[PDB]
Amino acid sequence: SHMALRVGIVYGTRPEAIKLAPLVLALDADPGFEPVIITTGMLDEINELFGLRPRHNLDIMRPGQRLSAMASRIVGELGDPLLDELVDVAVVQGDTSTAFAAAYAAACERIPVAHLEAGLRTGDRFEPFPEEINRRLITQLADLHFAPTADAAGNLLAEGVRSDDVYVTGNTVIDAMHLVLDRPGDSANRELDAFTEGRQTVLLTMHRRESWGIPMGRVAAAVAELCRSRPTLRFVIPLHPNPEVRRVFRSHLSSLTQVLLCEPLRYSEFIRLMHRAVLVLTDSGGVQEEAPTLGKPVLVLRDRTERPEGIAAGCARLVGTDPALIVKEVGRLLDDPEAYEAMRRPGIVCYGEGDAAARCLEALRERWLSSP
Amino acid sequence: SHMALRVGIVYGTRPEAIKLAPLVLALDADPGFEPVIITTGDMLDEINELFGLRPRHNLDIMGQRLSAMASRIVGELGDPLLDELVDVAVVQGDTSTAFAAAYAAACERIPVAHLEAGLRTGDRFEPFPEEINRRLITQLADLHFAPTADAAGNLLAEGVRSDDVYVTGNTVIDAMHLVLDRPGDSANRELDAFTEGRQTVLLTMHRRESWGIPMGRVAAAVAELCRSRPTLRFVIPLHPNPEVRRVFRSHLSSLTQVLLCEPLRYSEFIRLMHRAVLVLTDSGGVQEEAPTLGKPVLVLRDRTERPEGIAAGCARLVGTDPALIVKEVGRLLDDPEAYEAMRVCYGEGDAAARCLEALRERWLSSP
Amino acid sequence: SHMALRVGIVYGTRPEAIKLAPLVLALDADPGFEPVIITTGMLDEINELFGLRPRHNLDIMRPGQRLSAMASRIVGELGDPLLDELVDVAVVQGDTSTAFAAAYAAACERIPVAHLEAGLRTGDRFEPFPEEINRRLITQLADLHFAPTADAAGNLLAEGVRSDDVYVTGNTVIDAMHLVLDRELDAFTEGRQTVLLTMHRRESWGIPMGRVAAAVAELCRSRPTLRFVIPLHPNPEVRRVFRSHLSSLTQVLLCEPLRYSEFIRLMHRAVLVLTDSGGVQEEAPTLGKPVLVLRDRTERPEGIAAGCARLVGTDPALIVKEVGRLLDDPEAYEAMRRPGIVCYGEGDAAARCLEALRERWLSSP
Amino acid sequence: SHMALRVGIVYGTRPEAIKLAPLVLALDADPGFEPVIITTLDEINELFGLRPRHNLDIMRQRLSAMASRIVGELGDPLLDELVDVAVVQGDTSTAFAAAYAAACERIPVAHLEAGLRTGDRFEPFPEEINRRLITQLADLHFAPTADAAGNLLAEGVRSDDVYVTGNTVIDAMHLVLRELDAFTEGRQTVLLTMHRRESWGIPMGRVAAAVAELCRSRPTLRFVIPLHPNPEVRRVFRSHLSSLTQVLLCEPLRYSEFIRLMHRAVLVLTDSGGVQEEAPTLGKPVLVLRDRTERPEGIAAGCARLVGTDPALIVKEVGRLLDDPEAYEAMRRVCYGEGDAAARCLEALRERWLSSP
Numbered sequence A: 001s002h003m004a005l006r007v008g009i010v011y012g013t014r015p016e017a018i019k020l021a022p023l024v025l026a027l028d029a030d031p032g033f034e035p036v037i038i039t040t041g042m043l044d045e046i047n048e049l050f051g052l053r054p055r056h057n058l059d060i061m062r063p064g065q066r067l068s069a070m071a072s073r074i075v076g077e078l079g080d081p082l083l084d085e086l087v088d089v090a091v092v093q094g095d096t097s098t099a100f101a102a103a104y105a106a107a108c109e110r111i112p113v114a115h116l117e118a119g120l121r122t123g124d125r126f127e128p129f130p131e132e133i134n135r136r137l138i139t140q141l142a143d144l145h146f147a148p149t150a151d152a153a154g155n156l157l158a159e160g161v162r163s164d165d166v167y168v169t170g171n172t173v174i175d176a177m178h179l180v181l182d183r184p185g186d187s188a189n190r191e192l193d194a195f196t197e198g199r200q201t202v203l204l205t206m207h208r209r210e211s212w213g214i215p216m217g218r219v220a221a222a223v224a225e226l227c228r229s230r231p232t233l234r235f236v237i238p239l240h241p242n243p244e245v246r247r248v249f250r251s252h253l254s255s256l257t258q259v260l261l262c263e264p265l266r267y268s269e270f271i272r273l274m275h276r277a278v279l280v281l282t283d284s285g286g287v288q289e290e291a292p293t294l295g296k297p298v299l300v301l302r303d304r305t306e307r308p309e310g311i312a313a314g315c316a317r318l319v320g321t322d323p324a325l326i327v328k329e330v331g332r333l334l335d336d337p338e339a340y341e342a343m344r345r346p347g348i349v350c351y352g353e354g355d356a357a358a359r360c361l362e363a364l365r366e367r368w369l370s371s372p
Numbered sequence B: 001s002h003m004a005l006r007v008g009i010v011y012g013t014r015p016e017a018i019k020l021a022p023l024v025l026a027l028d029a030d031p032g033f034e035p036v037i038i039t040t041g042d043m044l045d046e047i048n049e050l051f052g053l054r055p056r057h058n059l060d061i062m063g064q065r066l067s068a069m070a071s072r073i074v075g076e077l078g079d080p081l082l083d084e085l086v087d088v089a090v091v092q093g094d095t096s097t098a099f100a101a102a103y104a105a106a107c108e109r110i111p112v113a114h115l116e117a118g119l120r121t122g123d124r125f126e127p128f129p130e131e132i133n134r135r136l137i138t139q140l141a142d143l144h145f146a147p148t149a150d151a152a153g154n155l156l157a158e159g160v161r162s163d164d165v166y167v168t169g170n171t172v173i174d175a176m177h178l179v180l181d182r183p184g185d186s187a188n189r190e191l192d193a194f195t196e197g198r199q200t201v202l203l204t205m206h207r208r209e210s211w212g213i214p215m216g217r218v219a220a221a222v223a224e225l226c227r228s229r230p231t232l233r234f235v236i237p238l239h240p241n242p243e244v245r246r247v248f249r250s251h252l253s254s255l256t257q258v259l260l261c262e263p264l265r266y267s268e269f270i271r272l273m274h275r276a277v278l279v280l281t282d283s284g285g286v287q288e289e290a291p292t293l294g295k296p297v298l299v300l301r302d303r304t305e306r307p308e309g310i311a312a313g314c315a316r317l318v319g320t321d322p323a324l325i326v327k328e329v330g331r332l333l334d335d336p337e338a339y340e341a342m343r344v345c346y347g348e349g350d351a352a353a354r355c356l357e358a359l360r361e362r363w364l365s366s367p
Numbered sequence C: 001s002h003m004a005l006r007v008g009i010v011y012g013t014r015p016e017a018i019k020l021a022p023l024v025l026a027l028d029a030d031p032g033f034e035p036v037i038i039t040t041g042m043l044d045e046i047n048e049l050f051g052l053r054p055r056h057n058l059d060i061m062r063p064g065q066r067l068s069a070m071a072s073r074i075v076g077e078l079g080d081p082l083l084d085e086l087v088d089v090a091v092v093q094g095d096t097s098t099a100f101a102a103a104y105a106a107a108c109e110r111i112p113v114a115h116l117e118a119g120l121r122t123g124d125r126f127e128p129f130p131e132e133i134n135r136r137l138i139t140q141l142a143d144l145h146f147a148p149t150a151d152a153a154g155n156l157l158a159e160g161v162r163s164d165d166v167y168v169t170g171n172t173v174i175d176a177m178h179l180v181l182d183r184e185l186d187a188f189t190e191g192r193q194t195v196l197l198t199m200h201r202r203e204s205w206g207i208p209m210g211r212v213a214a215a216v217a218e219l220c221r222s223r224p225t226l227r228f229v230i231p232l233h234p235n236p237e238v239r240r241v242f243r244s245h246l247s248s249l250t251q252v253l254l255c256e257p258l259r260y261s262e263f264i265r266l267m268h269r270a271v272l273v274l275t276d277s278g279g280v281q282e283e284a285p286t287l288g289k290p291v292l293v294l295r296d297r298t299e300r301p302e303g304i305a306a307g308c309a310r311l312v313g314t315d316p317a318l319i320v321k322e323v324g325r326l327l328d329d330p331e332a333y334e335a336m337r338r339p340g341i342v343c344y345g346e347g348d349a350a351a352r353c354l355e356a357l358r359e360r361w362l363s364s365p
Numbered sequence D: 001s002h003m004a005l006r007v008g009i010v011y012g013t014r015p016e017a018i019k020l021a022p023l024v025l026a027l028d029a030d031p032g033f034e035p036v037i038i039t040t041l042d043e044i045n046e047l048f049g050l051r052p053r054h055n056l057d058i059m060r061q062r063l064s065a066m067a068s069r070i071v072g073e074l075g076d077p078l079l080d081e082l083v084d085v086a087v088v089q090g091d092t093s094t095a096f097a098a099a100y101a102a103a104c105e106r107i108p109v110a111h112l113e114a115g116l117r118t119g120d121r122f123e124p125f126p127e128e129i130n131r132r133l134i135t136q137l138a139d140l141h142f143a144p145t146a147d148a149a150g151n152l153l154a155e156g157v158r159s160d161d162v163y164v165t166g167n168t169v170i171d172a173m174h175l176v177l178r179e180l181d182a183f184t185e186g187r188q189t190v191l192l193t194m195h196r197r198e199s200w201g202i203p204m205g206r207v208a209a210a211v212a213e214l215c216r217s218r219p220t221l222r223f224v225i226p227l228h229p230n231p232e233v234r235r236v237f238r239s240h241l242s243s244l245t246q247v248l249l250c251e252p253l254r255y256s257e258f259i260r261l262m263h264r265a266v267l268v269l270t271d272s273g274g275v276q277e278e279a280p281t282l283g284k285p286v287l288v289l290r291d292r293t294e295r296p297e298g299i300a301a302g303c304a305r306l307v308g309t310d311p312a313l314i315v316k317e318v319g320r321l322l323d324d325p326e327a328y329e330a331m332r333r334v335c336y337g338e339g340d341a342a343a344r345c346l347e348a349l350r351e352r353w354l355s356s357p
C-alpha cells in the first residue's frame, strides 16, 4: 500500500520490446515501482517469452501507412491511456516514431520522460529517416537519459543536455541476452542444430529500408558466391517480416542447400544460433551489440553505424553492400585465424555488463523517489 | 522455423472453397508452404468444417451493387494480406472476389496464381461479370493452373507466355476423391430412405440468367417426367436464393416423387450423385464431377465452359427447353445404348500436387 | 431534341486531357454526340486552353495516397455521376489507374467502354507499375480500341481482341499539336541552340535523374553557346534533383510546367529534345526534332525503327556523346529527321474515332 | 514561367504574422521565389497584404489534440501547393507541429527567429520545448543576434546552418512607421501590455495594483493598456482599473496604431517578446513584467530591466524613470538588427536552395 512510482512503458516493435523487457522485469520485482505497458503495434511472442502484459494496445501501426498519419494518431490518442493509468513517468526506447510521438504525448500531459538507450549518433543528418531525427527530438523531450556508453553520453552533452540528466547505464540488450542464455528449454531448435552441427555457419540478418531491392540483391549475390567457392560453409538467414525483403533473399538463395532461409526466430533461439555461428553479417543495431558479447566477429552491412565502440575496438568492421568487399572480408576471417582472433576481445565489454536494468532503476529512484 | 512460402487463399463461395480445399490441404502438409485463408463471404462454415479449413480473417464484405462490393475488396483486402505476411496469393474461378482480390494483391506487389485458369465460352460478357472477371484475372496472374489443354490454349490466345501456364487438371477431382474416402461422413439417412429401390435423377440449377421463367420451364419438365414415369424420383438441392427456392417450391412441392432439399454437405452430395442414374445441372463443378462418376450429364444452359465433356459425349446441352429435357431424359432412361454412349476430361485427382510443384518451381527456386 | 450518343470522358491528368481534348471538341461539334466530362484529379489550365467544361470533379486523386485506396474510391464512386449524367458509352485514355478503375466502374453499370490510344506495349511485365498492367486490364474491359499505329493494333490482336473491335485512328496528340500551332522563353532562346528536356518517370527519381542533370552540366561546361530549357514535373523530389544540380548554370532555364501552346512553340524552336515523356516522343518527330529518350524501354518503337528517336537511358557518358553527335555532325542530325514516314498519324485521329463510335453505337443491323 | 523556389509560410498568431510579413513581402518581390501562406489575423493580413492560400481551422483545446491535427492535416496542402521549402517562426505549437509535418514529407525547414533561450526548462510550457524541437528539425536557422546563434551551436547545430539575420520585427516596424490622441496629447503616457498565461489571476492583479498606486501618486500620469483577447485577462484589469480616468483600457490595437502609440509613450511595461525588441528601437525604456527574458541583449545594454510582478518594485522603477532624467537616459542610446533581416533571410535561402556546386 506504500506509493509506487507508476512507470509508463511504450513500444511498438520487437527491438524495443527486447530492450525494454529487462527494465519491465526490474520495475515489476522492485516494490518502489509499477510498470504500465502501452503498445502501439512477433510482439506477442516476445511478450510471452519475457512475461510482459500490456495494459493497452493502441491499434495504430501497420505497413503501408504515412509517417504523418501514424505520428498524428499517437500524439492524439496516447494521452488518454497515460492519464487513465495514472502514469507518473514515461519511458521510451531507441529511435522509433512511437518513441518520439509517445514522448511528445507524455510531455503534453506534463508526464516526465526517460529515454532508454540515449545518445546514439552516426553524424549523418536524416540518415536514416526518420530514426536519426527521432533521437534528436526525444533527446530534447526527455528529462532523464540512459546512455549505453561514455560516447553516447558525450553526444547528449553536445546537444545541450545537462550532465545531471545523463546516466551511463550500459545497454539493456546485454541483460536480455543473459536472461535467454539462462533458459535452455525455450532456446532449443532441432532443425537449426541439425543444419549447423559440424559446419562453419555465418548468421546473416538484413532489414534496413535504405538497402531494400538492389543493395540486398548484392548482399544475396555475395552469399551465393561464398557458397559456390566454399562447399563446407553454411548460412542461416532469418528474414525480416517484409514481403520485399523475403522476395529478394528467396529469389537469390532458395535453391542453395548451403543456405537455410528462416522465419523470424524467437529471441531465445536466435541468441542460441548466434552463439553457434562462426561470424555475423548484419545491419541490425542490436546484433552489433549482442554478437561481440558472444565473441563473434561482426561485419556490418551498412555505410555507417551508431555503434562506433565495436569499430574502434576491432570487434566490428563496416562492409556496406559491396559484394566484392563482403566476399573478401568473410574470406579473410575464415582463412586467416589471426585476422579472426583480431576481431574477438571476448574479455572486454563495449555495451555494458548486463546490469543496465538495475542502473536504470537506481537513476529513476534518485530522480523521482527522492526529496532534497 | 525454416522459411515457408506463405500462400494467401482468398474465396467467398462454396464452389471456390471446394476447389481450393485440396490445394489448402496440400500446402498445409508440405513443409515448404503455409496456407493463409482470407474469406470475403451457413454453406461456407459447413465446407470449412468438412475439409478442416481455418480462415485467419473473414472480411464480411459480401443484395449489394457489384461496384460497392469490388470497391470494398480492393480497398480492404490489402491490410490482412500485409498483416499475414503473404508472399503469393491464389484466387480460383471466375468470382468478383477472385478478380478484386487479385487486383488488391497486385497493388501490394504480391504475385498472383489463378487456380482453374483459361475456361471460356467465347460469348463476351456472358455471363456478366464472370466472363470478364476471368479475362481480368488472366492479365493480373503471374501463374495459371489450367485444368485442360484447351484451357491452356485459351490463355496463350490472350498473350500469356507458355512458361506461366501449367496444365494441372481440376482440383474438383481431388476434392471428390477426398470425400469418397470418407463413407462415415458421406452417409444420409433421409436421402437413402427417399431413393431406396427407385431410379433417382439429381438436378441442380442456380444461374442468375435462368431465374424466373427459364427455371419454371425446367420445373415443368420435371413435373411432366414425374407424371409420365411414376417410379422415377428427383432430388433437387436448392441454391440459397429466395427466388430460386420459390420457383421450384411453387412448381414441385406437392409431388411425392420430388425431394426438394436444403444445400447438401459436399460428402453427402457426391454420395447422392454416385447413386443417381443421371444428372441435370447448370453447375460448372457438377459438369466435372458427374462424368468422373460415370453419370451422363444434361447441361441446363445454351453454352458451357466445359466443351471437353460435350466433345467426348459425356454431356449434352439441353438449355431450358422443357420438350427437349423430357425427350433427352426419356432417351437415357429407355434406351441402354444411348445411356452407355454418354459414359479423363478434367484430370486424374492429383491437381493439388501439380499446383504445389508449379509454386515450388516459380517461387521456391533460385537461378 | 434528336437523341445524342452521350459519351463519358474520364481523366485525371494533363497528358490524358491533352489527348482527349481533340475527341471532346469533335464530339461537341458533331450533332450525333454529346461529350460528358468527369475528372478524378495544371488541369484547369488545359481545360481553359481547349474549352473543356467538366460536369463533375470527384476530388479522389492526391500526391501521397495508396493505389488500392485510390482505385477503391474510383470503382466505388464513379458509377453515380455516370448514371446521373445518363452516359451511354465511356471513353478512357492511356495507361492511368483512373482509366482502368473508370473502365471497371463503367463495366459494372453495363456502360460500354472505348479505349483511346490502345495497344502500346514494352513487353516488360509490370514495368512500369501499374501502367503496363492497366493497359492490359483496360484492353479486356474495352469494347472498342483506338490504336495509334498498325504495330499497336497488332499488340491488341495478340491479347485476343477481335479485329472488328480495333481501329487504327492514329494519335489524337497530333490533332492537339495542330490546334495550338494555329516572352521570358523567347529572350532566353532567341540567338541560341536550345535543348528541350522533360523527365518525370518515378522509376528514374533520385540517382538516375541526378545522372541526367550531370550530363546537362557537362554539355553546358563543354559548349558555352548551348542552352537548355527544363520545364519541371510538379513533384518536389524531381524539382529538388534538377535545382540542386543546375540552379547556378546561366545556360539552363529551369521552368514551371508550361501551358501546352507555349510548350509546343518552345519544342518548335528547340534544336533537339531529351525526354522520358510518351507524348513528347510523338510530338517532337512531328516538328522534325530528333528525340533522345531518357529510358531503357519505350512504348513508341515506331520512332526508334524509323530513326526519329534513340534510347539513351540515364547513362551520362552516352547522353553527352549522343547530344554531341547531333550538334556537331549535320549528317547525323538529318538522319533523325529524314522525310518519307509518318509514325503516329496525320492529325485526323479525332474524326476517325468519331466515325468508329458512329459505326458501333449509332447504327442498327 | 522560370522555376521559383516555392516557400511555405505557416503561422497561426499575430506575433508570427508580424514577424513573417517582411519575409513574405521580400519573397513576393524577388522573382526567384514564391511565398505560399498556410494559416492554422485578417487585420494583420490586410495591413501587410498577406493572402493565405489555405486556412486550416484547427486552433481555438488540448495541446495534444491541436498538435495531432496539424501533424495529421498540414501535409496535404504542403503537397497540393508544391512547396519546396517551409519557413516557421518563433516558439508556437504551430511552428513545431508544422516543422514536423514538413519533415514527414521531406520538405526542408527554415526557422525564423532561431536560438532564443531563457535556460529555464519547460518555462514557459510548451514554448521553451517547441524552440528546442524546431531547432533539431530545421535545416536553416535565422538567428536575430550572435547570442541566439551561440545557443543554437550549444544544441549541436552546425555553424554553416546558422545565419545572424537580425529580427524581422525591426523590418515590420519600419514598414508601418483619434480617441488615443485626445487621451495622450498633453500627458506622460505609460504603455502597458501583459498576456502570459503563467501571470494570469494574482500576478496580473499585483501589476494592476501597481498601476492604480502610480495613478493615485501622480495625477499627471496616464496609462494605455491594450488588453490581450482572453476574458480572464480583461476581467483582472477591468475589475482593478475601469473607474480610473488616468487609465485607458483598450481593445487590441492594429499594429500601425500600436507602434504610433509606443512612439508617443514615455516608457513601456510589457511581458511581450516583440515589444522588448520594438520599444528600444524607438528609444523607449522597457520594464519587463517577467522573472526571465529571451531578450538578454536589452538587459545587458541597459535598454530593459526585469521587474517581474512585484508591485513595490514596479512603482519604484517607474518612479525612478519619470523623476530622474539621468536614469531615463541610461535606458536609451542596435540589439536586434538594422531592419534588413528579410533581405538577409532571402540571400541565405538563395545560397542554400537556389545554388548548385
Ligand SMILES: O=c1ccn([C@@H]2O[C@H](COP(=O)(O)OP(=O)(O)O[C@H]3O[C@H](CO)[C@@H](O)[C@H](O)[C@H]3O)[C@@H](O)[C@H]2O)c(=O)[nH]1
Residues within 6 Å of the ligand: A014, A015, A016, A018, A019, A093, A094, A095, A096, A117, A120, A173, A205, A207, A238, A239, A263, A264, A265, A266, A267, A268, A270, A271, A283, A284, A285, A286, A287, A290, A306
Ligand atoms: O530472427 C530474429 C532476428 C533478430 N532478433 C533480435 O531482434 C533484435 C534486432 O531487431 P531489428 O529489427 O534488427 O532492429 P535493430 O536494427 O536492432 O534496432 C533498431 O531499432 C531499435 C529501436 O528503436 C534501436 O534501439 C536500435 O538502435 C535500432 O538499430 C535483436 O535483439 C536481435 O537479437 C530476433 O529475436 N530474431
Ligand SMILES: O=c1ccn([C@@H]2O[C@H](COP(=O)(O)OP(=O)(O)O[C@H]3O[C@H](CO)[C@@H](O)[C@H](O)[C@H]3O)[C@@H](O)[C@H]2O)c(=O)[nH]1
Residues within 6 Å of the ligand: B014, B015, B016, B018, B019, B092, B093, B094, B095, B116, B119, B172, B204, B206, B237, B238, B262, B263, B264, B265, B266, B267, B269, B270, B282, B283, B284, B285, B286, B289, B305
Ligand atoms: O447441394 C449441393 C450442390 C452442389 N454442391 C457442390 O457445389 C459445387 C458447385 O457449386 P455451384 O454453386 O453450382 O457453382 P458452379 O456453377 O459449379 O461454379 C461456378 O463458379 C466457380 C467459382 O468461380 C467456377 O469455378 C465454375 O467454373 C463456375 O461454373 C460442386 O462441387 C457441387 O458438388 C454441394 O456440395 N451441394
Ligand SMILES: O=c1ccn([C@@H]2O[C@H](COP(=O)(O)OP(=O)(O)O[C@H]3O[C@H](CO)[C@@H](O)[C@H](O)[C@H]3O)[C@@H](O)[C@H]2O)c(=O)[nH]1
Residues within 6 Å of the ligand: C014, C015, C016, C018, C019, C093, C094, C095, C096, C117, C120, C173, C198, C200, C231, C232, C256, C257, C258, C259, C260, C261, C263, C264, C276, C277, C278, C279, C280, C283, C299
Ligand atoms: O511543361 C510541359 C511538359 C509537357 N507538356 C505536354 O504534356 C504531355 C506530356 O505529359 P507527361 O506528364 O510527360 O506524360 P507522358 O509520359 O506523355 O504520358 C504517359 O501517360 C499518358 C496517359 O496515360 C499515356 O498516354 C502515355 O503513353 C504515357 O507515356 C505532352 O502532350 C507534352 O507536350 C506540357 O504541356 N507542358
Ligand SMILES: O=c1ccn([C@@H]2O[C@H](COP(=O)(O)OP(=O)(O)O[C@H]3O[C@H](CO)[C@@H](O)[C@H](O)[C@H]3O)[C@@H](O)[C@H]2O)c(=O)[nH]1
Residues within 6 Å of the ligand: D014, D015, D016, D018, D019, D089, D090, D091, D092, D113, D116, D169, D193, D195, D226, D227, D251, D252, D253, D254, D255, D256, D258, D259, D271, D272, D273, D274, D275, D278, D294
Ligand atoms: O495591442 C497590441 C499589442 C501588441 N501588438 C503587437 O503584437 C506583437 C506582440 O504579440 P504578443 O501577443 O505580445 O506576442 P509576443 O510575446 O511578442 O511573442 C511570442 O510569440 C512569438 C511567436 O512565437 C515569438 O516570436 C516571441 O519570442 C514570443 O515572445 C508585437 O509585434 C506588438 O507590436 C499589437 O499590434 N497590438
Ligand code: NA
Residues within 6 Å of the ligand: A027, A028, A029, A030, A031, A032, A033, A034, A035
Ligand atoms: Na514493482
Ligand code: NA
Residues within 6 Å of the ligand: B027, B028, B029, B030, B031, B032, B033, B034, B035
Ligand atoms: Na505446410
Ligand code: NA
Residues within 6 Å of the ligand: C027, C028, C029, C030, C031, C032, C033, C034, C035
Ligand atoms: Na455534339
